[PDB]
Amino acid sequence: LHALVDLGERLTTLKADVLAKLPLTDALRKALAEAPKHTANIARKRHILFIGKLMRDQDQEAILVLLDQLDASTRQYNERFHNLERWRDRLIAGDDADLEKFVIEYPDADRQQLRSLIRQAQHEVARNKPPATSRKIFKYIRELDELQ
């Protein structure tokens, strides 16, 4: 109901890349390429209801399953992203005990370069500089996690 039209407009938001893997009728693919030509309130609402009606020709379960895969892989991204933001803040706020915990989770970390990074970011904290080195730490740890 509201749901199919909600589905419908979520589609209008995807890279063609992703859409090319979904099992959409030609009429949907067309409705969907046409969608940004509808600017006006009336034009847009019409087109998304029409997209709504068109959903009924699709395999909704298949579409939903593939969107769940995409949202799940962005959830997993976000979990690793926030984990890394916590590691960064913990290392800058803490001391060698936290460095050690970090390197146990990432035993390929260069300990001397991280230590050097931490020192410089603690200093910028303490001396109230632009916190540039904290951005470098987030970067270097993202590289260790392979957060792409």
Q: Do 84 and 128 belong to one domain?
A: yes
Q: Which of 43, 76, 109 is the last residue of a domain?
A: 76
Q: Do 47 and 101 belong to one domain?
A: no
What CA–CA distance (Å, rounded) separates 12 from 26?
15
Q: Which domain holds residue 42?
A: 1-76
- Distance of CA 134 to CAs 17, 33, 82, 91, 139, Å? 35, 42, 15, 10, 8
Number of domain units in the chain: 2
What CA–CA distance (Å, rounded) separates 132 from 112?
19
What is the three-class DSSP state of 17?
helix
**Token digits of residue 44:** 């847009």
Name which of 28, 24, 82, 23 is nearest 51 in CA terms.
28
What is the three-class DSSP state of 148?
coil
DSSP 61-114: HHHHHHHHHHHHHHHHHHHHHHHHHHHHHHHHHS-HHHHHHHHHHSTTS-HHHH
Q: Do 54 and 94 belong to one domain?
A: no
Name which of 121, 118, 124 is nearest 96 in CA terms.
118
Beta-carbon count within 10 A of 117 CB: 21
Q: What angle do the packed helices 111-126 and 132-145 form, to 10 degrees? A: 150
Q: Do 4 and 69 belong to one domain?
A: yes
User: Which residues does a chain break follow in the chain (C to N more than 2.5 Å)?
Assistant: none
Report the length, in residues, of the chain: 148
Name which of 18, 15, 48, 19 is nearest 34 in CA terms.
48
